[PDB]
Write a protein that binds this ligand. Structure first.
Ligand SMILES: Nc1ncnc2c1ncn2[C@@H]1O[C@H](COP(=O)(O)OP(=O)(O)O)[C@@H](O)[C@H]1O
Ligand SMILES: [Mg+2]
Length: 679
């Protein structure tokens, strides 16, 4: 029959895919799905990964929208994960026989693939909350679906609160909450005891393996699980290994590419595939590829995917029988008393481990090779990881809620309410940035900050830089800070990489070094060869350029001038460094007489991250990032003048409320000197 959007026949592609997708677990419940949808404003849908929730259900809601009178609106389906949203959009575009970016599309922070024609949009949970800023009832959508709500991300929880208020003012909107599990909060009690639909699992049983006692270096000891699986096992099937991020991942794909062809033609081939947050579409889509063929003589031609907890629940790779679970992941941590946010590798929950093992069972029965003991699972691990709202600084969150018109914050319906101390640190942060007044009301400046898709600190820095006549350079720095690490540092060629990085070093430090990289990238015409020559990440730089363009359009909308100072003047670099202070004045460390650094209020001993270009230890350093390892590192570091701290951020540098230390004694000396009294 006929494609309703194109008014043409559906294609050969379309029919081949329709055939396979009708067989997905979700389809036998479509009638009862439809029957709940037409009768209720909101309900919950639970089903294991691979059951067909993300691809099929939003199509059904499109079908539903096309049944309706003429207020002709979209469907939104939120993903916690960029790679999930972008790759399902491509998949669903194919399933619906449409062009990605036309009837089906996606929206990620700085990456909008959509048009006038878009009626189904796969977006991050973060982006839908962004859209609510300018459209508080989300009138562009008739159906909104929060997918992967079991991952309890910060943006997902806030969307559940928001949408629960939206449904009281809008009768025409439908909300669906989809999840892999019934745990991670109860959802239907939250949405006023609304219907539940559960899709049975087709998990081919999975043999859970362990190790005798605690493993120390799991990277190489999970490589030795990857190898022994790719010889000892006799039937076909692909491998999925859970690492914690995109260096450790790339390590294990550089490693295990010369090895394990340590071995001639004899053993079976391996198509090795990495998966992490950053990858562009054209290379996300290689997890969906057929493994290499069987050799005439030898072993199974096999596929190994090396991946973040993106593959835990957010998608399925067909072919996977063998799952290796190191049992850690890059979480977000936040002490509300230390006031330090950082990304930390840490032990997963029983919920999570069991999810990861689940992936091995999605074709035939499989084996999960968990690299722990039963004691490090049964007795030593949590049932459920804390929902992300209890592990984050809520500065951005609070600003977004205030921009959405939410005044009283304890009188706000969180599913799991945050510790009221973390809430109050967020209010203070925002008051220090002048985003909120002393009553906690949104200022004109706060309102504007909220429409930049940036941490409040960065937003304030961009806006305030106009008054230091260096908005152009601050926008470039901001864009470099908003994309992945730009310096390629192969572990086999550290001195070479470091020396290339030094070609760009500014004497006052790393922020200006990022400005130097960006300027050099542009004046060399976005050249890939230039990037290779200088060990600069071409993808990072292309991403930065795109972020800068996006941020530029926001500046134009708000009439904030995009200006530079005179490069021949000394004020050029001074002005930019003063601008950094307007946003980062709380991220400041003082050089002690001992050669250590102590963070300004919280008195934490830190050292300059070893990747810094700084030649010397500035007396005062402003930093972008606090890195928790076995040492505290401050990363992306600039030399600043303490006088700037007093002049630009007096509310924070209030000596009546400040701990005794070398920093306070210099600061008091500076404050007395400004006042030039002889009492
Ligand atoms: N991007 C893609 N490319 C090719 N095939 C896919 C893609 N995404 C999903 N599939 C296939 O279609 C199925 C649909 O699964 P999905 O809707 O993602 O399930 P759930 O969201 O419930 O985990 C998968 O099991 C897989 O076999
Ligand atoms: Mg899904």
């Amino acid at each position: 029959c006929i494609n309703p959007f194109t008014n043409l026949p559906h294609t050969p592609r379309y029919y081949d895919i329709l055939k396979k997708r009708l067989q997905l677990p979700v389809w036998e419940y479509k009638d009862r799905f439809t029957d709940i949808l037409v009768r209720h404003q909101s309900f919950v849908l639970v089903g294991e990964t691979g059951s067909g929730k993300t691809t099929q259900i939003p199509q059904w809601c499109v079908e539903y929208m096309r049944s309706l009178p003429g207020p002709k609106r979209g469907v939104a389906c939120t993903q916690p994960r960029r790679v999930a949203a972008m790759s399902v959009a491509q998949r669903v575009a194919d399933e619906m026989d449409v062009m990605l970016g036309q009837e089906v599309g996606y929206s990620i922070r700085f990456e909008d693939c959509s048009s006038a024609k878009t009626i189904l949009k796969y977006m991050t949970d973060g982006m839908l909350l962004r859209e609510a800023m300018n459209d508080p009832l989300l009138e562009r959508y008739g159906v909104i679906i929060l997918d992967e709500a079991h991952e309890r991300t910060l943006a997902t929880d806030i969307l559940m609160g928001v949408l629960k208020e939206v449904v009281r003012q809008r009768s025409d909107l439908k909300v669906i909450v989809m999840s892999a599990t019934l745990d991670a909060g109860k959802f239907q009690i939250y949405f006023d005891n609304c219907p539940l639909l559960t899709i049975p699992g087709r998990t081919h049983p999975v043999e859970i393996f362990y190790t005798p006692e605690p493993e120390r270096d799991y990277l190489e000891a999970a490589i030795r699980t990857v190898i022994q699986i790719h010889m000892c096992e006799e039937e076909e099937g692909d491998l999925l290994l859970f690492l914690t991020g995109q260096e450790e991942i790339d390590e294990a794909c550089k490693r295990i590419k010369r090895e394990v062809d340590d071995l001639g033609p004899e053993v079976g081939d391996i198509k090795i595939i990495p998966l992490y947050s950053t990858l562009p579409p054209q290379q996300q889509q290689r997890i969906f590829e057929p493994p290499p063929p069987k050799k005439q003589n030898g072993a199974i031609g096999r596929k190994v995917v090396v991946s973040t907890n993106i593959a835990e629940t957010s998608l399925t790779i067909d072919g996977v029988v063998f799952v290796i679970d190191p049992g850690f992941a890059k979480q977000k941590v936040y002490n509300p008393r230390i006031r330090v946010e950082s990304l930390l590798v840490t032990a997963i929950s029983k919920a999570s481990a069991q999810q990861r093992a689940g992936r091995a069972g999605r074709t035939r029965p499989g084996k999960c090779f968990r690299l722990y003991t039963e004691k490090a699972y049964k007795t030593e691990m949590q049932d459920n990881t804390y929902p992300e709202i209890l592990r984050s600084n809520l500065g951005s969150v609070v600003l977004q809620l205030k921009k959405l018109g939410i005044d009283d914050l304890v009188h706000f319906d969180f599913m799991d309410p945050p510790a009221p101390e973390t809430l109050m640190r967020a209010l203070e942060l925002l008051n220090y940035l002048a985003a909120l007044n002393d009553d906690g009301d949104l200022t004109e400046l706060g309102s504007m900050m909220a429409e930049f898709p940036l941490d409040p600190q960065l937003a304030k820095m961009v806006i305030a830089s106009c008054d230091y006549n260096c908005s152009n350079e601050v926008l470039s720095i901001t864009a470099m800070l908003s994309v992945p690490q730009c310096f390629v540092r192969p572990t086999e060629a550290k001195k070479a990489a470091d020396e290339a990085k030094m070609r760009f070093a500014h004497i006052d430090g790393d922020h200006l070094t990022l400005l130097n990289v960006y300027h050099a990238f542009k004046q060399n015409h976005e050249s890939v060869q230039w990037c290779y020559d200088n060990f600069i990440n071409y993808r990072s730089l292309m991403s930065a350029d795109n972020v800068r363009q996006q941020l530029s359009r926001i500046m134009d909308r708000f009439n904030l001038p995009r200006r530079s100072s005179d490069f021949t003047s000394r004020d050029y670099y001074i002005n930019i460094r003063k601008a950094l202070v307007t946003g980062y004045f709380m991220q400041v460390a003082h050089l002690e007489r001992t050669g250590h650094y102590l963070t300004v209020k919280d008195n934490q001993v830190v050292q300059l991250h070893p990747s810094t270009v700084l030649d010397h230890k500035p007396e005062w350093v402003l930093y972008n990032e606090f890195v928790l390892t076995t040492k505290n590192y401050i990363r992306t570091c600039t030399d600043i003048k303490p006088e700037w701290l007093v002049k630009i951020a007096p509310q924070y540098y209030d000596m009546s409320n400040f701990p005794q230390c070398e920093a306070k004694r210099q600061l008091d000396r500076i404050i007395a000197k400004l006042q030039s009294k002889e009492y």
